Amino acid sequence: PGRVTNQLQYLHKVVMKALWKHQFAWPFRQPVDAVKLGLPDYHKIIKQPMDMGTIKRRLENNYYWAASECMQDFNTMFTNCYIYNKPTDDIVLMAQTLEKIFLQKVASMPQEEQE
Amino acid sequence: VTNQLQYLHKVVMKALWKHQFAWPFRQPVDAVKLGLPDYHKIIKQPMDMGTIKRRLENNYYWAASECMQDFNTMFTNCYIYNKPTDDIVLMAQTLEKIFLQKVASMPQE
Numbered sequence: 595p596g597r598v599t600n601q602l603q604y605l606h607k608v609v610m611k612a613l614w615k616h617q618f619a620w621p622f623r624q625p626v627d628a629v630k631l632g633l634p635d636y637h638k639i640i641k642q643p644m645d646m647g648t649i650k651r652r653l654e655n656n657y658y659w660a661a662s663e664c665m666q667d668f669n670t671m672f673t674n675c676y677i678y679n680k681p682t683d684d685i686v687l688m689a690q691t692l693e694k695i696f697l698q699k700v701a702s703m704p705q706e707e708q709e
Numbered sequence: 710v711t712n713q714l715q716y717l718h719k720v721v722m723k724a725l726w727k728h729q730f731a732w733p734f735r736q737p738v739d740a741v742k743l744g745l746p747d748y749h750k751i752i753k754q755p756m757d758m759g760t761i762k763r764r765l766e767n768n769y770y771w772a773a774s775e776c777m778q779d780f781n782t783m784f785t786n787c788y789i790y791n792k793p794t795d796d797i798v799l800m801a802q803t804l805e806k807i808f809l810q811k812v813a814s815m816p817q818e
């Protein structure tokens with residue numbers, strides 16, 4: 595099903611920890627609530643919702659088999675934001691800022707995955 | 710030249726450049742050719758694979774994360790500018806997943 599690996603530990607304790615506490619992270623810590631936000635078209639446009647709270651819970655429950663699977667969920671979270679929102683929305687700039695940190699930290703992840 | 714930039718050139722760019730969905734991304738967006746008079750009003754930092762490839766060939770980058778940010782900007786511009794239902798968005802998503810899969814095995818500095 596899933597494993598604990600050196601890389602998944604790094605994504606959890608180093609990458610996710612740094613993104614979670616960021617001042618721009620608050621819109622991303624829980625699923626988009628289309629009802630609360632009054633976005634009745636959100637789920638007609640975005641077919642795979644994702645958020646850091648869901649990723650964090652997956653990391654804690656050993657859901658992922660490999661680091662790449664977790665990285666793809668981070669990517670989906672950011673990509674959903676760019677696809678749905680207007681280019682001028684502040685949330686787009688917040689996602690871009692977080693995504694740059696994600697890439698910087700991923701650049702220093704351990705090279706070979708080990709259980 | 711670093712270990713990581715060599716990986717980005719020999720593994721990541723090699724895989725992306727020859728991909729069957731790469732052709733819209735191999736040269737800068739030509740807004741005149743494509744009839745997109747608002748492209749440069751929305752997208753303020755254009756980026757494309759031909760530019761990244763030339764920068765790798767020319768030892769332009771000082772750190773691997775700089776190259777990774779250019780890949781990211783190229784994909785993000787596509788998501789921001791295009792309509793969600795445009796095929797180019799699916800093509801970018803496919804290429805970006807390959808990018809992330811390969812970056813998962815990139816060496817450390």
Ligand SMILES: CC(=O)N1c2ccc(-c3cc[nH]n3)cc2[C@H](Nc2ccccc2Cl)C[C@@H]1C
Nearest residue numbers: 620621622626627631633674675678679684685
């Ligand atoms: C991530 C994302 O895609 N979105 C999202 C998700 C959650 C929240 C949220 C959580 C708690 N309160 N509001 C807000 C937003 C964005 N709205 C927004 C963002 C920043 C400033 C002002 C606004 Cl209006 C819309 C968009 C659909």
Ligand SMILES: CC(=O)N1c2ccc(-c3cc[nH]n3)cc2[C@H](Nc2ccccc2Cl)C[C@@H]1C
Nearest residue numbers: 732733734738739743745786787790791796797
């Ligand atoms: C990457 C990107 O953002 N775009 C882009 C860039 C270059 C090209 C291109 C190069 C040579 N010929 N066409 C086309 C496109 C997209 N168009 C498009 C893509 C696939 C199928 C049909 C169409 Cl209409 C629009 C969008 C603005």
